[PDB]
Each structure stands twice: as C-alpha cells, then as structure tokens.
Design an enzyme around this catalytic site. Structure first.
Site, PDB file in Angstrom:
ATOM      1  N   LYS A   7     -41.755 -42.590   0.412  1.00 38.74           N
ATOM      2  CA  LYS A   7     -41.140 -43.590  -0.442  1.00 38.74           C
ATOM      3  C   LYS A   7     -42.048 -43.885  -1.639  1.00 38.74           C
ATOM      4  CE  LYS A   7     -39.173 -48.263  -0.413  1.00 38.74           C
ATOM      5  NZ  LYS A   7     -38.799 -49.398   0.464  1.00 38.74           N
ATOM      6  N   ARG A  10     -41.570 -41.118  -4.145  1.00 40.12           N
ATOM      7  CA  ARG A  10     -40.255 -41.173  -4.771  1.00 40.12           C
ATOM      8  C   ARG A  10     -40.222 -42.286  -5.818  1.00 40.12           C
ATOM      9  NH1 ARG A  10     -35.879 -44.366  -3.675  1.00 40.12           N
ATOM     10  NH2 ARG A  10     -36.734 -45.001  -1.644  1.00 40.12           N
ATOM     11  N   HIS A  12     -42.873 -43.889  -7.262  1.00 44.89           N
ATOM     12  CA  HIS A  12     -44.009 -44.204  -8.109  1.00 44.89           C
ATOM     13  C   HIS A  12     -44.671 -42.995  -8.775  1.00 44.89           C
ATOM     14  CE1 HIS A  12     -43.781 -48.170  -5.906  1.00 44.89           C
ATOM     15  NE2 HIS A  12     -43.567 -48.433  -7.210  1.00 44.89           N
ATOM     16  N   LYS A  41     -32.814 -51.950  -9.228  1.00 44.64           N
ATOM     17  CA  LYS A  41     -34.138 -52.483  -8.951  1.00 44.64           C
ATOM     18  C   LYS A  41     -34.708 -53.139 -10.214  1.00 44.64           C
ATOM     19  CE  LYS A  41     -38.656 -51.534  -6.908  1.00 44.64           C
ATOM     20  NZ  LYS A  41     -39.749 -50.562  -6.654  1.00 44.64           N
ATOM     21  N   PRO A  42     -35.177 -54.410 -10.164  1.00 52.64           N
ATOM     22  CA  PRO A  42     -35.612 -55.114 -11.377  1.00 52.64           C
ATOM     23  C   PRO A  42     -36.806 -54.506 -12.103  1.00 52.64           C
ATOM     24  CG  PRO A  42     -35.093 -56.691  -9.662  1.00 52.64           C
ATOM     25  CD  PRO A  42     -35.073 -55.323  -9.008  1.00 52.64           C
ATOM     26  N   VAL A  43     -37.833 -54.109 -11.352  1.00 53.54           N
ATOM     27  CA  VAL A  43     -39.089 -53.679 -11.952  1.00 53.54           C
ATOM     28  C   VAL A  43     -39.650 -52.518 -11.130  1.00 53.54           C
ATOM     29  CG1 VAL A  43     -41.420 -54.422 -12.625  1.00 53.54           C
ATOM     30  CG2 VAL A  43     -39.530 -56.072 -12.685  1.00 53.54           C
ATOM     31  N   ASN A  44     -40.229 -51.518 -11.802  1.00 56.47           N
ATOM     32  CA  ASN A  44     -40.847 -50.405 -11.091  1.00 56.47           C
ATOM     33  C   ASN A  44     -41.826 -49.672 -12.011  1.00 56.47           C
ATOM     34  OD1 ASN A  44     -40.454 -47.144 -10.191  1.00 56.47           O
ATOM     35  ND2 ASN A  44     -40.699 -48.640  -8.540  1.00 56.47           N
ATOM     36  N   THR A  45     -42.990 -49.275 -11.463  1.00 63.85           N
ATOM     37  CA  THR A  45     -43.990 -48.542 -12.230  1.00 63.85           C
ATOM     38  C   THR A  45     -44.033 -47.082 -11.781  1.00 63.85           C
ATOM     39  OG1 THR A  45     -45.326 -50.524 -12.488  1.00 63.85           O
ATOM     40  CG2 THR A  45     -46.428 -48.437 -12.915  1.00 63.85           C
ATOM     41  N   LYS A  66     -52.122 -58.120  -2.570  1.00 67.18           N
ATOM     42  CA  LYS A  66     -51.524 -59.393  -2.956  1.00 67.18           C
ATOM     43  C   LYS A  66     -51.076 -60.207  -1.740  1.00 67.18           C
ATOM     44  CE  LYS A  66     -50.207 -58.411  -7.751  1.00 67.18           C
ATOM     45  NZ  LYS A  66     -49.119 -58.019  -8.679  1.00 67.18           N
ATOM     46  N   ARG A  85     -38.520 -52.104 -16.637  1.00 70.76           N
ATOM     47  CA  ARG A  85     -38.066 -53.468 -16.407  1.00 70.76           C
ATOM     48  C   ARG A  85     -36.629 -53.650 -16.900  1.00 70.76           C
ATOM     49  NH1 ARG A  85     -40.872 -58.399 -14.595  1.00 70.76           N
ATOM     50  NH2 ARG A  85     -42.873 -57.385 -14.186  1.00 70.76           N
ATOM     51  N   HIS A 119     -47.888 -48.127  -0.827  1.00 69.59           N
ATOM     52  CA  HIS A 119     -47.355 -49.277  -1.548  1.00 69.59           C
ATOM     53  C   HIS A 119     -48.031 -49.359  -2.915  1.00 69.59           C
ATOM     54  CE1 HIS A 119     -46.104 -53.374  -2.527  1.00 69.59           C
ATOM     55  NE2 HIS A 119     -47.399 -53.720  -2.606  1.00 69.59           N
ATOM     56  N   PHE A 120     -47.258 -49.697  -3.957  1.00 66.34           N
ATOM     57  CA  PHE A 120     -47.853 -49.973  -5.255  1.00 66.34           C
ATOM     58  C   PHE A 120     -48.005 -51.485  -5.408  1.00 66.34           C
ATOM     59  CE2 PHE A 120     -48.935 -48.576  -9.553  1.00 66.34           C
ATOM     60  CZ  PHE A 120     -48.815 -49.747 -10.267  1.00 66.34           C
ATOM     61  N   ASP A 121     -49.251 -51.951  -5.514  1.00 69.54           N
ATOM     62  CA  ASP A 121     -49.503 -53.377  -5.413  1.00 69.54           C
ATOM     63  C   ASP A 121     -49.433 -54.017  -6.796  1.00 69.54           C
ATOM     64  OD1 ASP A 121     -50.089 -55.429  -3.244  1.00 69.54           O
ATOM     65  OD2 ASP A 121     -51.786 -55.814  -4.593  1.00 69.54           O
TER      66      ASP A 121
HETATM   67  K   LIG Z   1     -43.683 -51.264  -9.295  1.00 67.91           K
END
Ligand SMILES: [K+]
Length: 124
Positions: A7, A10, A12, A41-45, A66, A85, A119-121
């Site tokens: 995941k 996929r 990040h 999805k609202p936000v993703n890097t 976090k 975004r 996980h992307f923190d």
């Molecule tokens: K993100």
C-alpha cells in the site's frame, strides 16, 4: 488483501519521474493509483526517488511518529516529492487536485523484513 508495504508503494512511490511533470500530474496519478477509487482522497504525497533510496530511509534518523509510535524515520537528505491536494470544484469521481513540487525530508514508519516503509508520516 494488500500488505502495508505494498500500500505504501501504491500510494507514495513514483520513481518514474524526477519531479511532477505538469499541473495535471496529480489528477492523473491519484486516479492511476486508485486514490480516487471510492472517494477523492483529500491529500497525498508522492516521492520521486528510487525505491532503494526510499527504503533506505528506514535505516536513517529514528524519530517518533505523529501518533506517538516509535518506528518512524526522517531522511537524512531532502528528496523530490509532489504534494497532491484536492480543490473546491472536485466532484467524485472527477477528482481534482492542486500539484505542488518540493524538495523535503520525508518521515516514514517502517516494518517487516526487509524493513521498508509502511506509512507516510510527514515531510519537513
Ligand atoms: K500523504
């Protein structure tokens, strides 16, 4: 079905470009990675370094996550990222995004053998 490591790739990883290729990059990428599958999805890097270089962050600076968990790491180097975004006119499934290219440190949580991001923190 999907592993946390898979995941992460996929959501990040995009090492096929060194930086966002257009203002339209996020619209294309959020769709192709199934981040507009059930909702926008609202936000993703996305990170634009090799998979090896991103996995290597799991051997770098250990920091708190976090959420207060302990297995997070901050990249020693800045890395090419794109922030996606969602914008005001977005209506699912015609999800619309603003694209922002940056060169930031990334912070990821890591698990498994091999020890890789799950996980992307955040970025800094
Ligand atoms: K993100």
């Amino acid at each position: 079905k999907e592993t946390a490591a898979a995941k992460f790739e996929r959501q990040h990883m995009d090492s096929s470009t060194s930086a966002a290729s257009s203002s339209n990059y996020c619209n294309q990428m959020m769709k192709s990675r199934n981040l507009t599958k059930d909702r926008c999805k609202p936000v993703n890097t996305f990170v634009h370094e090799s998979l090896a270089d991103v996995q290597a962050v799991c051997s770098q600076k250990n920091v708190a996550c976090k959420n207060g968990q302990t297995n997070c790491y901050q990249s020693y180097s800045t890395m090419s990222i794109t922030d996606c975004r969602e914008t005001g006119s977005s209506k699912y499934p015609n999800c619309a995004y603003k694209t922002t290219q940056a060169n930031k440190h990334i912070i990821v949580a890591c698990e498994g053998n091999p020890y890789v991001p799950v996980h992307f923190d955040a970025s800094v």
